[PDB]
């Protein structure tokens, strides 16, 4: 059963769209398949989205796939709500809970904002760009409220590049009238390529500063100039390299041809990329169920005019997403759910922070259970309290009344317990008090 | 189909208000069909060709009242149905007026 | 190597020992923050020079 999909590329996305084919070549099954309607075309004009989807409606076909934008995420809501026709995305999270909308990118605010808490944060800049949307920008200032943090938020990207030099430059001198030392980015990660360079520039990677980028491909950019810089740069995962389901496809993806997949003979990849052929895996299962169902999608192709007034729908369609909504497979993105909406649950982000080595896990954050550390204690030295011998004897060394409430080395009071902090002042150690056991000052 | 219905009908000037649902649709189409537009309603935001807007703008006397009322720290209530310009306009300034 | 570790910052000096210290790249830490030094055997603004 070829079955007429559709597929609508930003033009671009070839990796993905190799992916696509990669997924195409995986998860196409023996008896139902796919008529893949690819549609490499641009994403900004809403008219040249709206043609493009009148056409595979004019194709009729049973499902449409592709990226988004912002301009367009209105309308293809408004079309979705209106056709009755199930969409799959990748890209960005939706805001309103829109029915016949799939998505396959999970939220990332709930992680962060355990992050900041993590990290325990006041004070930091947010450096930002408008076109992936505002509602992470619009969630975190509510916290801020709440959490008493003074944020400086500043949109970036709408600077030209014919300026792209001299406006940071502008800019970071803004941050140094605060003296700024923790910044979070969320821009593309060409942009963070574009901006982490004039960083360098400027040589603010030193110790002192600390940096976090916000997407799910924390190690897709360049992260070696500034892996020895000084300060601290840390992200995230939704891509555990480590998998054996990873790593059998990275054997997979590596030896691909460059020519015949380009940007796929390559040693990692983009979790855009990753999304993009974990939809399939979710798309052939779809297709499996409805014959496992013995639901038929027997509907012609000839759907009308999307102007059609009233356009009637199909509750087929329905069906359909009815049964999205119940596929639970494992891939890329390890486990995936969805709720009523399409949106993803019962996923789980890993923290990864660059180091000497490179990056490195220290924990996850699941979708309800929040950010745990997975422990490693690779501090090979640990400044050791050392071992201080004493005998209680006024005025040396005296026991606090309250020595009961108190703890450690504060529960001794007297004059040697003033000096035990001058050598600790001046050589810099750490200590612990200790009382000789037998009482006695010691004889052989 | 209500705009493709009076260009069906092939009219010489389009005339109403707006969503800002409907202002990357409006801005998509009077690009495209070359059909001169003219809103009352709230300003846009990206420099269009066929959009002829009635409302002026209002952040450059805003501004100005603030700084008339010579003031340094406030809340702002908001809703985004409006459009956010003005939202992420005032944080400039307030990150240069600390 | 000295802007891969990031010592081209404030606090640092740096004098290069030849004639042609303008031939090199400059430009990568003529915003650095240290100050770097030279000399010319040649004048670019001289007229048999131009």
Redesign the interface.
């Given at each position: 059963n070829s079955i007429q999909i559709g597929g609508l590329f930003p033009r671009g996305a070839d990796q993905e769209y190799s992916a696509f084919r990669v997924g195409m070549v995986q998860f196409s099954t023996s008896e139902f398949r796919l008529t893949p309607h690819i549609d490499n075309l641009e994403v900004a004009?809403?008219?040249?989205v709206?043609n493009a989807f009148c056409s595979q409606f004019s194709r009729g076909v049973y499902a449409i796939f592709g990226f988004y934008d912002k301009?367009?995420v209105?309308?293809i809501t408004?079309f979705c709500g209106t056709l009755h026709v199930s969409f799959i995305t990748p890209s960005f999270p939706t805001d309103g809970t829109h029915p016949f909308v799939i998505q396959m990118r999970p939220d990332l605010k709930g992680a962060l904002l355990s992050l900041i808490e993590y990290y325990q944060w006041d004070k930091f800049a947010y450096l930002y760009d408008?076109d992936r949307g505002?509602s992470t920008l619009?969630a975190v200032l509510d916290s801020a409220a709440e959490k008493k943090w003074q944020v400086?938020?500043?949109?970036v990207g709408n600077i030209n590049n014919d300026k792209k030099d001299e406006t940071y430059?502008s800019l970071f001198q803004?941050l140094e009238l605060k003296k700024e030392r923790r910044v979070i980015l969320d821009c593309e990660r060409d942009k963070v390529n574009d901006i982490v360079d004039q960083v360098?520039?400027?040589?603010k990677?030193?110790k002192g500063y600390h940096y976090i980028i916000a997407n799910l491909g924390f190690t897709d950019g360049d992260l070696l100039?500034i892996q020895?810089?000084?300060a601290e740069v840390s992200g995230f995962q939704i891509v555990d390299y480590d998998d054996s389901l990873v790593s059998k496809f990275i054997e997979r993806w590596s030896t691909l041809e460059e020519k015949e997949y380009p940007g796929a003979h390559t040693a990692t990849i983009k979790y855009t990329s990753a999304l993009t052929y974990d939809a399939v895996q979710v798309m052939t299962e779809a297709f499996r169920n409805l014959r496992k169902q013995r639901i038929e999608i027997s509907r012609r192709g000839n759907a009308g005019d999307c102007?059609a007034?009233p356009a009637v729908p199909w509750g087929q369609g329905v069906e359909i997403e009815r049964a999205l909504k119940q596929v639970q497979v494992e891939g890329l993105s390890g486990n995936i759910k969805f709720d009523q909406n399409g949106k993803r649950i019962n996923y789980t982000i890993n923290i990864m922070e660059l180091k000497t080595n490179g990056p490195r896990k220290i924990g996850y954050w699941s979708e309800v259970d929040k950010m745990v550390l997975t422990e490693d204690d690779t501090s090979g030295l640990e400044q050791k309290t050392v071992v201080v011998t004493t005998i209680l004897e006024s005025p040396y060394v005296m026991m606090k009344k309250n020595h009961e409430m108190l703890e450690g080395n504060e529960r001794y009071e007297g004059y040697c317990v003033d000096l035990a902090a001058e050598i600790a002042k001046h050589c810099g150690f750490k200590y612990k008090l200790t009382i000789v056991g037998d009482g006695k000052y010691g004889a052989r």
């Open positions: 004009n809403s008219f040249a709206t301009k367009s209105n309308t408004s408008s505002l619009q400086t938020a500043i949109n430059r803004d360098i520039t400027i040589g990677h030193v100039k020895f810089g000084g102007l007034n």
